Amino acid sequence: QAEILLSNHYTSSEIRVFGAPEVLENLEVKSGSPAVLAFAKEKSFGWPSFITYTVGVLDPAAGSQGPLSTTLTFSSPVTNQAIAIPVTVAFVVDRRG
Amino acid sequence: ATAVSRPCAGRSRDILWRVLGWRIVASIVWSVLFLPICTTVFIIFSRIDLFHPIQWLSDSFSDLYSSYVIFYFLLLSVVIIIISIFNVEFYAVVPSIPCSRLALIGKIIHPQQLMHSFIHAAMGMVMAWCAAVITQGQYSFLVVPCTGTNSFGSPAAQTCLNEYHLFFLLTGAFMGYSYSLLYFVNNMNYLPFPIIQQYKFLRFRRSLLLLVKHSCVESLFLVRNFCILYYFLGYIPKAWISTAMNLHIDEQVHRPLDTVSGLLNLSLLYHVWLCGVFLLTTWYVSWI
Numbered sequence A: 001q002a003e004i005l006l007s008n009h010y011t012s013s014e015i016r017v018f019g020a021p022e023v024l025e026n027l028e029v030k031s032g033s034p035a036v037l038a039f040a041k042e043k044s045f046g047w048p049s050f051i052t053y054t055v056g057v058l059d060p061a062a063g064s065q066g067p068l069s070t071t072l073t074f075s076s077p078v079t080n081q082a083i084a085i086p087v088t089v090a091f092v093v094d095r096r097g
Numbered sequence B: 001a002t003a004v005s006r007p008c009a010g011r012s013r014d015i016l017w018r019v020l021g022w023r024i025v026a027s028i029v030w031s032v033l034f035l036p037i038c039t040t041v042f043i044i045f046s047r048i049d050l051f052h053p054i055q056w057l058s059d060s061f062s063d064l065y066s067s068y069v070i071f072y073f074l075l076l077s078v079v080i081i082i083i084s085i086f087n088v089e090f091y092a093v094v095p096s097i098p099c100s101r102l103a104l105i106g107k108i109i110h111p112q113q114l115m116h117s118f119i120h121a122a123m124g125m126v127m128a129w130c131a132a133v134i135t136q137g138q139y140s141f142l143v144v145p146c147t148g149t150n151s152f153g154s155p156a157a158q159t160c161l162n163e164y165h166l167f168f169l170l171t172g173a174f175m176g177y178s179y180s181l182l183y184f185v186n187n188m189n190y191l192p193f194p195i196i197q198q199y200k201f202l203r204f205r206r207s208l209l210l211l212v213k214h215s216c217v218e219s220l221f222l223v224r225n226f227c228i229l230y231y232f233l234g235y236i237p238k239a240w241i242s243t244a245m246n247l248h249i250d251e252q253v254h255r256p257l258d259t260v261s262g263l264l265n266l267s268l269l270y271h272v273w274l275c276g277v278f279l280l281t282t283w284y285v286s287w288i
Helices: A021-025 B008-034 B034-048 B051-066 B066-088 B101-108 B113-134 B163-185 B200-205 B210-232 B235-244 B266-287
Strands: A004-006 A013-020 A028-031 A036-045 A050-057 A068-076 A080-092 B142-145 B159-161
Touching: A004 A013, A004 B163, A013 A036, A028 A036, A036 A068, A080 B113, B008 B034, B008 B066, B008 B235, B008 B266, B034 B051, B034 B066, B034 B113, B034 B266, B066 B113, B066 B266, B101 B113, B113 B163, B113 B266, B159 B235, B159 B266, B163 B210, B163 B235, B200 B210
Parallel strands: A004 A080
Antiparallel strands: A013 A050, A028 A068, A036 A050, A068 A080, B142 B159
């Protein structure tokens, strides 16, 4: 996933960060807003090596005040490498406008 | 318990409903029956171009038959019914003359005459809302997405407060308050009977031409007074509404109406004046 969208119909999403096993072992995750979280679901060190993170909203009320866009940064101090993914949160009392 | 012992407090009103009830109902029906003649004229005066007058007339009818104009006409008919009903609370057969300046202040601060100025401010704000959606374009909505945010970072569609729609709504509130204040200050609520009774069509055909001339001048004074009021206070509703809804301000695309170099915009001033002419004419038609 290059960007993430969270809403009434997609309350979470599942992104894989790929890398080398040592870089994935020491992989931090940092959100630009406390209303958006990510947790590690599964690690694979077998090729192609990855970690699936389940990403989701902690508070739908923060997601109701407007389209909350933030970033989710995955970073590994062992290589000083980081990847930052946009996250849009949009929770709606939907119908015709 | 306890419906007993007051039959004369029926009978005294029940004769008043025999004599006046159908006269009130006929007045309410005629107040609504003139509303299409006011809304057609409001669209035709807001759509004016001077180079393509065939398209001006074409597209004025394209809006007139549109389902959104039909809905706002049904809301505006309820507003005119309620204004016609408040003329039935507040009428006087003897003029409520203030024998001192303190008596005039005490008349304005009377709780029903205050209730009528709050309710007319609300009806003026709702009528200005209907008018601002009927004039479309930059007037149409209180909230607009930020018009320059090409700064890749945050795919959240950010939102700004539409200061021109706020100026429309707040002019409507000021006009409704001012009408209700004028209604008790001038004793417009007084019913002087005619020295010369006359058939209704002549009695109205003689007064409507004086009213449309009055509405055009009184709207121009109310917009002039509101422009002076906004130049000293506009920031207060503006900063309250931006904080209360967490809305931004597009200070790069729009000039703020706290500034004389935004507030002197002739297009806004014309459409807000025309809204005041529609407001005053429909409300004074119900009163007449």
